[model samples]
Target chain A: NQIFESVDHYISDLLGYEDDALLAATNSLAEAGMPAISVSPNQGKFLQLLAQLCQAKNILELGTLAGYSTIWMARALPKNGRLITLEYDPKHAAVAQKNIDRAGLTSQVQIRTGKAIDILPQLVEEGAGPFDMIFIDADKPPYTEYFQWALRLSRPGTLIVADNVIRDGKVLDENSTEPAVQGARRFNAMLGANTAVDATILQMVGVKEYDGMALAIVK
Target chain B: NQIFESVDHYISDLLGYEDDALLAATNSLAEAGMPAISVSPNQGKFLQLLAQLCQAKNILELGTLAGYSTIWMARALPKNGRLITLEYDPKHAAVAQKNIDRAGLTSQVQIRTGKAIDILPQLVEEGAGPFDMIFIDADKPPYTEYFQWALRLSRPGTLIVADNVIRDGKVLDENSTEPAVQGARRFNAMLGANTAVDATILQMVGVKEYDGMALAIVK
Candidate 1:
């Protein structure tokens, strides 16, 4: 924790930019009494860089927590690019919509209100994808299911990122009955066995607690 | 350390693949009395995935330690793709050449023996760049210089990855006289301040010791 805090401060001093939209999004989370689980500023920018490097024109996000990360990633999109983020809670979705509109990114972002499990199928039915990038950061119990939907929506070379897979190393306990840990274990196993993509998990520590991100590229 | 090792093993078991070429390259390092400092199997595959996601056609590597990483990234290249790697030690270059040949990547990879600072300018003189990806992993003292060269060789959206930038959080001590730590600090400062790219540092731990990597995309 000491090293994480120090390095996070160092990184923030150097790479973190001051943006009014991102600031407002964080403020909106507190004002709405919502959970403050959005990604760290550095990680949000890293995701934006991934989107840029992949030349992603269309993006899909499984969770929209006050649209903090949505704004971060949406700023990476070209003028013609689009991003659709799903949030199950109408209250959270409403907060996210307000934040997104405040960012003046309404034309580039769409906040869909529903469970990801229900919305993913609808997106498929309507031919809403072949997305270039997908970010999954919702409830852990359905991570594998979300990953399957991600695969279904991807083209070759699509970048799929799933957060909170490590859960502070609780994933190491194979016998643990914790649903989040179990779900992460199951999703990691599925990622290992799947042949459609190449993937790896990166341990992360910073302003947030220790966790990991699963980074996969469709093959 | 235990958590790091366990997570690394989990990642390897799930995502690491069997490759005789990679195995042989590691063995060659040991046989030649070279430091076993190549990227781990999971990290190697991750690099490959980055190359693929960026659709890299031309890559520049500042270090070619037995070509383990070169092979990993080269395998991601299309048939016509090219990779030029620099090695400061001729003996290491020889070992890498043999391992690369064993991997059947002789046509795709070119190992240039020289200091990166010297070769980078020559590359510029020859109009050899605007590379899609650049990896910097040489001696610590010239990391900032190597990064400058990387920027010179990059196009917008180019992926630049620098390994071992954290050095177990040594970069935090501003007054430390250690050359590697100072080099990393300088490089990180430059990366943070440069408007030409967006970057973040990822803390890494595994079979290797605690360290971190700098991942940047040219703006």
Candidate 2:
């Protein structure tokens, strides 16, 4: 317990005001009527850490909410590291670009606006992968497609992160016809069924509004 | 959308009633007070597919929860293949043994019950590794240590699946103080800090109560 207390206190301090700041950005994204997409601060931090861990020269992001997460990830890049974030909304993408630029991440962050599914294939055709890491936080119903496309473009060491997986626990209902939930359920099942990827889901607390996440690795 | 719809529908069928029956055994374990440990039937099926795809002969599990996941892992093994599961609770371990026996997976599945911290050393001493896949789902607090240990025991192609990593979203809470949550945060951080293990958290759906999970690879 003492160790736990010390660590929590340390994280609380290290994170400082950024949590609120990030949350505010997420709320703004929601207020703009994005409907389902929201940024995960912890996942963003994890991505930042992944960038550093892999000494990643290039990182791929499937969704850019407010550029808050992109900023965090970009900051972790070395002087030459590149972070390419894909977003579908022109307005949201524009905001993310501006925010990322404001955070001095423009050098390392590349915001791509369009349907990711279409753009992703183009990127693959141009040989844009063997990516060390990938973060997916985009349109829901097509998550499995994104994973498949990402996997094809990834190398053995590639790490892929998909967000908004829980869909507020709606995926388990089975009868729920919500496209997002159905997609999530399918995405999870696909991940589990795929021999090339290993994935898991956990129950998380706080912002208890959504269920949680699914993490996978390409073999 | 049609492509995604077809993929989803196909997966929905793949994750059929039999899959639910298998998952139900795992659910019963959680209901009987196991520490939120489970193996997604989809994941199990995926592992089987992977074993077939990779022609895997050796597999390992860092955590075994009532043997449901073990059964899945075992299905992937060839007649000569072996799957070893490490469990911490003897009571739960006994339950897994019974279930594995009932499932007729006793020969292919081996359950080692005790603190993985202790048992891992013994396995290494016995020269029992070069595993192709490792599934981790034991104590939340020891995730980092277990990962390090697993790395030593695993070969280059080892795929590690870490469960309950999101800690029910506590990993995101700036104010969370629970030991599991604190450990999870640190573990998530360490996943980035450690260069040897390439890890990513994926937000998974379909789970009613848990947050998500992380998938890591030994580079």
Candidate 3:
């Protein structure tokens, strides 16, 4: 009922505003006929702040939709730092790559096209991380699995964030038949009960729908 | 209106709930006929997680309303860590002290009863801090002053947070006559222009009215 999109704009007006390149990136989704479901501009800045707060030198993201947030997080990386993002669809991955290239973040970011579940195992086998931060914003049905892999890639003090975990608070619907809702509920329960991390979810409102982000730090 | 109190409850149900001590602290405000303006349960945990993220050894707070948030941030400190909170009213201070004591955080948390504007200069002159985290939640009229003092008491990598800067999006009203609104606007402008830190404001919604926290980290 409270439309806070203007609140977000007021924030971005002072804190940050997307450059032409960033705007182009958001528009690419419409041009490609994809959903405009990227993280809000304010949320994108929040991710950037989180990455910096964690002193992130290495980052991992489970989705690369348009690379809007990916570009935000990658900006937090040091010159020699790296961020690898996974996207299952080659088409979306192509759009994201162009966005990253437009933002001139190609030097710090790598876009990997494949199922994150499968790629996660390969990274684990190769001893890929000890990543400083990991973000999940992909398919909800695999959120629990994604979190498991995130833990495997994390070390002490690593920040692992999962977006849309509340899915407009549908997770509260115990009998909902939606698998996404089930996935969210399942992941939240696992996060709460997991002893390896300290976690909390903060409800958000802005240009987007009602939702929350699951934030956990490995202990 | 979409009352998302239920959303907050769902998140708290999974992440945390007010224990007896926390419940008592919040209730004490109502008991004392004080404004029930303490940070929400989720935001309390947000401060706790932020303290942990900063790896805070020493913290400074400009307000100590009922010590609800104090207990939360105090829990994040190491055994030897210290959190010095300034409160203007002895009435509120007295209420907060009892709650802190009951929380068994007397050792780590110090309640200083005085105007924060006065106490802040004293802390500066006493060579008190280089605190790792500083939170401002007191009078809005002096938010700019509080922020400057927060910066003085901070070191590189310190996280400085100020509450209610959005003030229900009143910052967007250019002609608002309320001093609190002007104070918020002034503080936001200073934060935007200040180069010593990188900052952003995240709009919040929950048990409280629509507001946002201005978060800055010293560079």
Candidate 4:
């Protein structure tokens, strides 16, 4: 843990993971009484890189936690690129809107106020994608559903990422009753079984604790 | 570390990280008296996923340790796609050639034997790149050099990944004299400053000891 802590600081120092906009977004979460569960700066930068690498002109995010990650990924967008993020809680959506506006990305990112399960279908009904990239970080109980939606929204080569799938290794407990664990286990199995994509999970540890991210490329 | 171990196995099981070809490649490394420092099965699969996510048709790798990682990345290639891996050791290159042939990927993979420093320029002279993805996993001392070459060979949206950049938090010691640590520190700084890529370092732990990887997307 010391090594993780030390190395995290080392990376942050060298990478300059902090800036006014990101710091303000983090503070906005706390100020709005939202849970401080946003992805760390390093992970945010990683997401940005993935978006850029994929040349994501139209991005989809299943969660909008005070728009910290939304800002990170949206910054990767070129002019006229769009990122639609779904947030179930109205308060969180409102807070995210404020933070996104503060980051000068209000034009690039749209905050959809509804459950992802509900919004995903509406997006499909409206022919919203063929998205280039999708990020899933919302309620864990519906991770499998989110991934299915991700697939429906993707074209070949779409980068789909689901965070917190490991859940501190609780996903290994096949008999666990925790909804998050059950969801992650089911999602991992489904991801592996679904031949529509090439996928793998990477274990993540550092400032946010131990978890894992599932990364898949639509085939 | 037990949780890390358990989750790693869990990931590999769900993702089906190993197959007859991969298992045989590992065995081949052992049989040839090669160091078993090849990326773990899950990490190898992760690399393959990154290649696919980036839609990498042309790949370059700086290390070919028995062709384990080379096979992983090469399998992600399309039928006519190519992967060029540079290995300095003739013994390792020979072992890799046999394994690559065994994997039936001889047509898609080329093993170039020489110091990377010596060969990278030749690649440039021969117009071998504008690669879609580049993986650096060679010796630590010239990591920064490898990265420079990676940049030279890259176009916008190229994915560049360098393994073993953390060295168990040794990069934190600004005064450390270890060549690997010094090299990693310098590489991290150069990467952070280059302005040609969007990059981040992720802490990695599982079957391998604690380390990290630098992932960059050329901009």
lDDT of 3: 0.90
Query: Residue A64 deviation, candidate 2, in Å?
Result: 2.0
Q: Compute the lDDT of residue A72 as modeled in candidate 3.
A: 88
Give the distance in Å from residue A144's predicted Cα in candidate 1 to where it truly belongs.
1.2
- Chain A only: TM-score per candidate: 0.98, 0.84, 0.97, 0.98
TM-score of each: 0.97, 0.55, 0.96, 0.97
* Poorest stretch of ten by lDDT in candidate 1 chain B: B201-210
Superior by TM-score: candidate 1 or candidate 2: 1
Across residues B41-88, which tens digit of lDDT does each residue of candidate 1 receive? 878988888898878999999899999999999999998999999999
Classified by CAPRI criteria, candidate 3 counts as medium
In model 3, state the lDDT of residue A49: 88
Evaluated on chain A only, model 2 obtains a TM-score of: 0.84
lDDT of 3 by residue, B11-82 (tens): 788777688889999999988988889999989989999999999999999889899889889999999999
TM-score, candidate number 3:
0.96
Worst 10 residues of 4 chain A by lDDT: A9-18
User: Candidate 4, residues A1-219: lDDT per residue as tens digits?
Assistant: 767877777787767467788898899876899999999888888898888878889999998989988988998899999999999999999999988888889888899999999999999999999999999999998999899888889998999999999988888887999998898988998987899988889898888878889999887
DockQ of each: 0.75, 0.07, 0.71, 0.76
Model 3 chain B: which ten-residue window has the lowest total lDDT?
B1-10
Model 1 per-residue lDDT tens digits across residues A114-153? 9999999999998999999999998899999999898889
